[PDB]
Homo-oligomer: A and B are copies of this chain.
Amino acid sequence: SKLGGTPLDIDWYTSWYGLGMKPFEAKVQKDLIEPLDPKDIEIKPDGLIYLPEIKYRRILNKAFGAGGWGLVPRSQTIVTSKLVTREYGLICHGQLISVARGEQDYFNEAGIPTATEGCKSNALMRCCKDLGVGSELWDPVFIKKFKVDHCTEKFVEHVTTKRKKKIWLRKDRQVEYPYK
Contact = CB atoms under 8 A, between A and B. Distances in A.
Contact of A70 (B1, B3, B4, B19): B19
A61 interface: yes
Contacts of A100: 117, 120
A40 interface: yes
Nearest to A62: B33
Interface in A78-113: 78-80, 82-83, 85, 91-103, 105, 109-110, 112-113
Nearest to A90: B20
A70 B113 contact: no
How many identical subunits does the complex contain?
Answer: 6
A125 to B, nearest CB: 11
A9 B22 CA distance: 13
A83 B113 CA distance: 10
Given A2-B8, A96-B70, A57 B19 contact: no
Given A3-B112, A42-B140, A54-B138, 16 more contacts: A1-B8, A2-B5, A3-B109, A10-B16, A16-B72, A24-B68, A28-B66, A57-B132, A57-B135, A61-B132, A66-B130, A67-B93, A67-B95, A70-B97, A70-B130, A117-B126
27 contacts: A1-B6, A2-B8, A2-B112, A3-B79, A8-B78, A10-B17, A11-B16, A20-B68, A20-B70, A21-B67, A22-B67, A23-B64, A23-B67, A24-B68, A32-B66, A52-B140, A53-B138, A54-B129, A54-B139, A55-B139, A57-B130, A66-B130, A82-B110, A83-B113, A85-B113, A105-B110, A117-B126
Interface of A: 1-13, 16-24, 28-29, 32-33, 39-40, 42, 52-55, 57-58, 61, 64-73, 78-80, 82-83, 85, 91-103, 105, 109-110, 112-114, 116-117, 120, 126, 129-132, 135, 138-141
